[PDB]
Design a protein around this ligand. Structure first.
Ligand SMILES: Cc1ccc2c(C(=O)NCCc3cocn3)c[nH]c2c1
Ligand SMILES: [Zn+2]
Length: 140
């Protein structure tokens, strides 16, 4: 589990969105595994605006933050999980690291701010849904 809280927005994995998220929906995209809902309070996270390929992510199944090198956001085939059938997921970055299903939502950050959240993974992999192209998260 986990979310990004920027401005009056809450960014979560679409497959972990709650009824309150869906009742206060701003934007969602199944192909990216992302959903954004509105919040009453303002958040503290800042979004990175960059092309970094190195950063640090939180792994809840280890209670640890790990430094990683990651690929640029791309369209990558992803195998079935409990939330989606095997399918192409867009705007996805891969790194070598540990990821179990409940690790979804952990933040990946670089020197500029938040880069994305955990969504995919397995056999020494972990995939992140990028948010650096969502420029509207910085306004309204
Ligand atoms: C071993 C293993 C198995 C499953 C996962 C996993 C997961 O279930 N969430 C994916 C949400 C999703 C995107 O695409 C498909 N399903 C995240 N890390 C894992 C690691
Ligand atoms: Zn950066």
């Amino acid at each position: 589990s986990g979310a990004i809280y920027v401005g009056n927005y809450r960014v979560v994995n679409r497959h972990l969105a709650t009824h309150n998220d869906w009742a206060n929906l701003v934007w969602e995209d199944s192909s990216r595994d992302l959903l954004v809902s509105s919040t009453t309070a303002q958040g503290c996270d800042t979004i990175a605006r960059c092309d970094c390929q190195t950063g640090v992510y939180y792994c809840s199944s280890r209670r640890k933050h790990y430094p990683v090198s990651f690929s640029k956001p791309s369209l990558i085939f992803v195998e079935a999980s409990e939330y989606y059938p095997a399918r192409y997921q867009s705007h996805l970055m891969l790194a070598v690291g540990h990821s179990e299903p409940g690790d979804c939502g952990g933040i990946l950050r670089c020197q500029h701010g938040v880069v994305g959240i955990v969504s995919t993974g397995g056999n020494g992999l972990v995939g992140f849904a990028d948010v650096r192209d969502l420029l509207w998260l910085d306004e309204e």
